[PDB]
Paper text:
The metazoan transcription elongation complex (EC) of RNA polymerase II (RNAPII) generally stalls between the transcription start site and the first (+1) nucleosome. NELF is a large, metazoan-specific protein complex consisting of four subunits, NELF-A, NELF-B, NELF-C/D, and NELF-E. It binds both RNAPII and the nascent RNA transcript emerging from RNAPII and inhibits transcription. DSIF, a conserved heterodimer complex of Suppressor of Ty 4 (SPT4) and SPT5, is required for NELF recruitment and RNAPII pausing and also serves as a processivity factor upon the pause release by NELF dissociation. In the present study, we determined the cryo-EM structures of mammalian ECs containing RNAPII, NELF, DSIF, and/or TFIIS stalled on a nucleosomal DNA.
In some of the NELF-containing classes, RNAPII had advanced to collide with the downstream nucleosome, and we reconstructed the PEC structure containing RNAPII, DSIF, NELF, TFIIS, and the nucleosome (PEC2-nuc). In this structure, NELF binds RNAPII in mode 2, simultaneously with TFIIS. There is no apparent contact or steric clash between TFIIS and NELF. After stripping ~20 bp of the nucleosomal DNA from the histone surfaces, RNAPII is stalled within the downstream nucleosome. The leading edge of RNAPII is positioned around SHL (–5) of the nucleosome, consistent with the previous in vivo observation. In PEC2-nuc, the NELF-E basic helix directly contacts the nucleosomal DNA. Thereby, NELF and the nucleosome seem to cooperatively restrict RNAPII progression beyond SHL(–5) of the nucleosome.
Residue numbers in the entry:
A (entry chain W): 40 to 582
B (entry chain A): 578 to 673
C (entry chain V): 1 to 194
D (entry chain H): 2 to 150
E (entry chain A): 914 to 1058
F (entry chain U): 1 to 132
The structure:
């Protein structure tokens, strides 16, 4: 006892022993030893700091000075979280909890906050050997905060919950059309493609849905979205996708498509094999060679400047692409009926001419303009329209291309206008390319040419808005106006010319989306001018 | 270099017997595309430029005045500096 | 050492010993004092178990919390002295200094009081008269606080200045009676600037 | 055995940049099992090949099945059994370079071995676990034979 | 930045040292402080030589004419001894440093011991000494040769 | 390549495919699938975890058809024996892949005592019918 007495007194001689966590046990041992507590109290008289009270006093000082209680609480909680991170012991915690034999309330107090929930998750992941961590995870689930427990990789191991959440996500996708698919697609694709087995079952179910010839376009689109999201993660399942379809009846074509999509490149040998198969009297289902990745490979190889392809297989590549795109086949009950070959010779000739224009880059743009009749005749093919779209995208994507582009209203944007006029399916793509063109701020050009290009891009956006693709264009224009990335005069010109060319009556959707645009002061103080026909004034009076 | 279907020797294979000793040199052909080194196939030239000589063996490349004439660092200069003057004389005679 | 805490109602070690001297059960009293009037957050009392069972006594993070909240308070008061309205922030700092001169006698919180008093460009008369009576409190004062002290204390300012003049005279005499006699360097050789 | 490497390839491409030389063609080939890629020059005049053809490639360090070494001198009047009897096309070169995805900290995973057959180059590229017998400045053989299957 | 990261020869990254040197050498270059001080002094001399060069050769002209072709000699040594630049090498860097230091003394243009002759000899071979040090480094002898 | 025994085969499979973080089948399955391992799976398949069975089933498809042709019997046998487990997942995958050794494609049969499958198919079909 005397040795323990000396040890306890030496502990008491340390600074501020009043703030010990086992001070109850230390005092119990001192009482058991029979020593008088007078020495302990005398030592603690000089060894007590209000390290539990002066913190509150300084917190009150902080509140009075101007510090909001929210930040004070956040700082205290963050410091306590760090201290808990640095001071965890599994086995003594387990022993103390077994001695307790019950569920502590202070653990529930920790569960109440999110920071301690994340700390408990990190602790549970750190040491698999501690039962307390699974205990706390179970209690968090019991308290209703099982959402904080990891579920991004848990849904892959779960069959029914994953299937039902997939059902709800797809139903919500079909509720809002594309405008809600664009939002519900990221997380849904993440959860579906996180596990390969869930990916495969999703593809199997979705393709079985796509079997029906009526309404199957959206189903095929969603399946392709899942496939491309899986591919984006570097995860490849193209061969399984081919095996899901009707590739069995054509093993050679299945081989060629699988090899190309596995490598991601086009080899002349398999191109020649496909040419032999399709040119023969028994072509396979054209839908199999219409995979977005495969057509993208054709487009990239046949249109990208700086990429070279064999001149002895150029016509075979063009023929295969033309047969893939323009040729129409009649099908009933998964059986072929007839094949349309109307757009086979002229389509091939147009693709050949456009590819010659694309890959013969050393010719100036003036020569491109000089052949405008043939150019505009051949641009009416939607696949060729997308080809020239992305060819222009890649040419102007060069930082030094603008210096070579010597027109205030360049012919490239005229080609984009023709593309928008010809087809409405490319209008989302036209809007995307226009957004990329406008958002690209150039520092190696004079601001005068920057302003000219931005005005011409505004004209292009006005044209796109005119042809019926309005809502995303309007939303993007409002975002740019509120984003300060667009000059005030630019939006002034855009809105003024829009209200100049458009005519009433305006729909409720357009009025709703356009009223906040005129709400901004940059327009109210500029476009509002003294005139008998004021665009902002007339639009407001129309409401 | 080719055993079956019939024995065949290559011009570079025979010429390596002319290069004396163990001589290491790297040159470039007159018609070498300057943009080949940056891209792939830098060490395997499609046009057989980029003369490389290792241990007195013509690994690859096509010889021209840029590697056999009176240029600094050419093959004969390397032969003179590394070997003696007699061996270089034998080299000159053997080539012709 | 722990004086001045009693003024604000936060009892220090003196009243602690006074209360526990005539107390039979220290366990419940100390638990309530560290729980009831302590940090009024379930977070800290709920963190006490884990930090206890780690083997590192709770005194360590208690002291760390006190010191880091002190530092955060000081830095935020410094920022407030240079943010917002000048008169409003100065009045808030005056209130803080008036309520910290109760704890000015605490060396672990003396930096708080001294830094906040530095934060005030013009300390009121009575608080200056209080601080200048103590040697260490007088010596720890900032340049502005010392300026306020000397602006209305002629004799003390002269006493402060006198040793510097003595050093100046000693250096001048040593230079005038320098052993090194040459025209290259002399008493009048150096420029007035240096 | 001294068989450094053995796998099946198919001619996925022919000389893409064009016909640089009359009697030599540049073969681009892909494997089946190890997923290798191959770049090869062949004497197209005596061993004609076509697109889509398949062949067995057996890079051996020696032509004698017993495994003994050779001086490297042409001795046509030899009697020992040889691997060349069951192969159509044989080269004999010397690896001159071995690249890879090496970093300053960890080892390589994808390797690339170049061997020159008296002027006709060849690049073998793949995963590090296969190109182990390839060490620079060592003579090897090619021993390829077409598979009619 | 590039000059330092290409000539420093850091002696703290153990994993990087593993690929280049054997165990008995990486432990020696990691534990001993005399070696580290010597190599840091070598890098300081490197930087001093760089400063001298940048006033000797303005306009950034790297081409120069010097007696021995160091790169070709290194290549010849590699081909003679079958280095196999894939495995770790048994080359203690201090051997390289002190070998270069000793070799510098053996190349004499002005022979003598009085300060005038020593200064003349130091000048007459200054460029060759700078080049020789700049190739036969400690990092280059371990990461490049 | 030896007929490494049953429990040892299961341990090897759970060592090569036991990464729970890697929920995707590795590209190594092209070389990891040989006759000995597949044959030994005939008894150690019970010793494999559900994730191991799922990943093995996914990786069975990533094979060249020459290997498939020369491993017809082993692949059909492993499919059949995987079609006799407690996991409905492995049952369905074995049924879907039974067609691969014969035609090279995948079977598509549904609406068979799978509540999630039937409900999802019905709701998506009616939803598409709403907005064709």
């Amino acid at each position: 006892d005397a040795e323990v007495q000396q040890e306890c007194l030496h502990k008491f001689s340390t600074r501020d022993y009043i703030m010990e966590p086992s001070i109850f046990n230390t005092l119990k041992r001192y009482f058991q030893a029979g020593g008088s507590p007078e020495n302990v109290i005398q030592l603690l008289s000089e060894n007590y700091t209000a390290v539990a009270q002066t913190v509150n006093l300084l917190a009150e000082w902080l509140i009075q000075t101007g510090v909001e209680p929210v930040q004070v609480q956040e700082t205290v909680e963050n410091h306590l979280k760090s201290l808990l991170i640095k001071h965890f012991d599994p086995r003594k915690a387990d022993s103390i909890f077994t001695e307790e034999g019950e569920t502590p309330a202070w653990l529930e107090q920790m569960i109440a906050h999110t920071t301690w929930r994340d700390l408990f998750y990190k602790l549970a992941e750190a040491h698999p050997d501690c039962l307390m961590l699974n205990f706390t995870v179970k209690l968090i689930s019991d308290a209703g905060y099982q959402g904080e427990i990891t579920s991004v990789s848990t849904a892959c191991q779960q069959l029914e919950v994953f299937s039902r959440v997939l059902r709800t996500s797809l139903a919500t996708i079909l509720d809002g059309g594309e405008e809600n698919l664009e939002k519900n697609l990221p997380e849904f694709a993440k959860m579906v493609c996180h596990g390969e087995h869930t990916y495969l079952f999703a593809q199997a179910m979705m393709s079985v849905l796509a079997q029906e010839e009526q309404g199957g376009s959206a189903v095929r689109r969603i399946a392709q979205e899942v496939q491309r999201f899986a591919q984006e993660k570097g995860h490849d399942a193209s061969q399984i996708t081919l095996a899901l379809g009707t590739a069995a009846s054509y093993p050679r074509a299945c081989q060629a498509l699988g090899a190309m999509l596995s490598k991601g490149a086009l080899n002349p040998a398999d191109i020649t094999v496909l040419f032999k198969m399709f040119t023969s009297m028994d072509p396979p289902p054209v839908e199999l060679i219409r995979v977005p990745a495969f057509l993208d490979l054709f487009m990239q190889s046949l249109f990208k400047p700086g990429a070279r392809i064999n001149q002895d297989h150029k016509h075979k590549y063009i023929h295969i692409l033309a047969y893939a795109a323009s040729v129409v086949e009649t099908w009933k009950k998964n059986k072929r009926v007839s094949i349309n070959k109307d757009e086979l010779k002229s389509t091939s000739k147009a693709v050949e001419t456009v590819h010659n224009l694309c890959c013969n880059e050393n010719k100036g743009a003036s020569e491109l303009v000089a052949e405008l009749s043939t150019l505009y005749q051949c641009i009416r093919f939607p696949v060729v329209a997308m080809g020239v779209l992305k060819w222009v995208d890649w040419t102007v994507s060069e930082p030094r291309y603008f210096q070579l582009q010597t027109d205030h209203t360049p012919v490239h944007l005229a080609l984009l206008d023709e593309i928008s006029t010809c087809h409405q399916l490319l209008h989302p793509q036209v809007l995307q390319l226009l957004v990329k063109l406008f958002e690209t701020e150039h520092s190696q050009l004079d601001v005068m040419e920057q302003l000219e290009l931005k005005k011409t891009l505004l004209d292009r956006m006005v044209h796109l808005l005119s042809r019926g693709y309005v809502l995303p264009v309007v939303s993007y224009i409002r975002k740019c106006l509120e984003k300060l990335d667009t000059d005030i005069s630019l939006i002034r010109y855009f809105v003024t010319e829009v209200l100049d060319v458009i005519a009433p009556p305006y729909t409720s959707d357009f009025v709703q989306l356009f009223l906040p645009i005129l709400e901004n002061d940059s327009i109210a103080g500029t476009i509002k001018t003294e005139g008998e026909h004021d665009p902002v004034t007339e639009f407001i009076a129309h409401c | 270099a080719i055993l079956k279907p019939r024995p065949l020797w290559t011009g570079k294979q025979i010429f390596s017997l002319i290069i004396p000793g163990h001589i290491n040199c790297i040159r470039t052909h007159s018609t070498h595309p300057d943009d080949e080194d940056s891209g792939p196939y830098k060490h395997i030239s499609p046009g057989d430029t980029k003369v490389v000589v290792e241990n007195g063996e013509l690994i690859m490349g096509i010889l021209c005045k840029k590697s056999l004439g009176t240029s600094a660092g050419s093959l004969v200069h390397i032969s003179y500096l590394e070997m003696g003057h007699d061996i270089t004389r034998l080299f000159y005679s053997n080539i012709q | 050492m722990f004086a001045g805490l009693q003024d604000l109602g936060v009892a220090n070690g003196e009243d602690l010993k006074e209360t526990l001297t005539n107390c039979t059960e220290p366990l419940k009293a100390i638990e309530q004092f560290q729980t009831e009037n302590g940090v009024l957050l379930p977070s800290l009392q709920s963190a006490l178990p884990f930090l206890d069972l780690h083997g590192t006594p709770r005194l360590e993070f208690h002291q760390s919390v006190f010191d880091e909240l002190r530092d955060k308070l000081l830095e935020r008061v410094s920022a407030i002295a240079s943010e917002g309205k000048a008169e409003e922030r100065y009045k808030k700092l005056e209130d803080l200094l008036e309520k910290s001169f109760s704890l000015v006698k605490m060396p672990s919180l003396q930096p708080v009081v001294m830094c906040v008093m530095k934060h005030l460009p013009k300390v009121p008369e009575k608080k200056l008269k209080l601080v200048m009576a103590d040697k260490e409190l007088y010596r720890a004062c900032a340049v502005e606080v010392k300026r306020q002290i000397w602006q209305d204390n002629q004799a003390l300012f002269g006493d402060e200045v006198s040793p510097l003049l003595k050093q100046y005279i000693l250096e001048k005499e040593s230079a005038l009676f320098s052993t090194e006699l040459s025209v290259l360097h002399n008493f009048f050789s150096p420029s007035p600037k240096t | 055995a001294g068989i450094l490497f053995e796998d099946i390839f198919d001619v996925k491409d022919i000389d893409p940049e064009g016909k640089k030389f009359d009697r030599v063609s540049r073969l681009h080939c892909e494997s089946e099992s190890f997923k290798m890629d191959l770049i090869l020059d062949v004497n197209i005049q005596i061993y004609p090949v076509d697109l889509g053809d398949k062949f067995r490639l057996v890079i051996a360090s020696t032509l004698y099945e017993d495994g003994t070494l050779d001086d490297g001198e042409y001795n046509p009047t030899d009697d020992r059994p040889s691997r060349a009897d069951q192969f159509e096309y044989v080269m004999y070169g010397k690896v001159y370079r071995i690249e890879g995805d090496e970093t300053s900290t960890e080892a390589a995973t994808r390797l690339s071995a170049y061997v020159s057959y008296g002027g006709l180059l060849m690049r073998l590229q793949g995963d590090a676990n296969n190109l182990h017998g390839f060490e620079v400045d060592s003579r090897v053989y090619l021993l390829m034979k077409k598979l009619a299957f | 930045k590039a000059f330092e990261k290409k000539f420093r020869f850091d002696y703290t990254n153990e994993r990087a040292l593993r690929r280049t040197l054997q165990e008995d050498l990486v432990k020696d270059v990691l534990s001993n402080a005399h070696i580290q001080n010597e190599l840091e002094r070598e890098f300081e001399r490197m930087r001093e030589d760089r400063e001298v060069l940048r006033v000797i050769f303005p306009t950034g002209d790297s081409k120069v004419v010097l007696p021995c072709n160091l790169l070709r000699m290194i290549w010849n040594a590699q081909k003679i001894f079958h280095i196999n630049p894939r495995l770790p090498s048994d080359l203690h860097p201090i051997k390289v440093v002190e070998g270069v230091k000793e070799l510098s003394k053996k190349l004499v243009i002005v022979n003598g011991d009085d300060p005038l002759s020593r200064q003349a000899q130091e000048n007459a071979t200054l460029l060759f000494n700078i080049h020789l040090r700049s190739t036969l480094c400690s990092r280059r002898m371990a990461e490049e040769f | 390549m030896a007929s490494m025994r049953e429990s040892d085969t299961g341990l090897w499979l759970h060592n090569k495919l036991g990464a729970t973080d890697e929920l995707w089948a590795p590209p190594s399955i092209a070389s990891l699938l040989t006759a000995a391992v597949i044959d030994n799976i005939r008894l150690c398949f019970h010793g494999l975890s559900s994730a191991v069975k799922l990943k093995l089933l996914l990786g069975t498809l990533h094979l060249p058809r020459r290997t498939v042709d020369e491993m017809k019997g082993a692949l059909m046998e492993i499919i059949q024996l995987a079609s006799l487990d407690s996991d409905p997942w492995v049952l369905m995958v074995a049924d879907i892949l039974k067609s691969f050794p014969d035609t090279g494609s995948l079977n598509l049969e549904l609406e068979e005592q799978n509540p999630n499958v039937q409900d999802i198919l019905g709701e998506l079909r009616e939803k598409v019918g709403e907005c064709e």
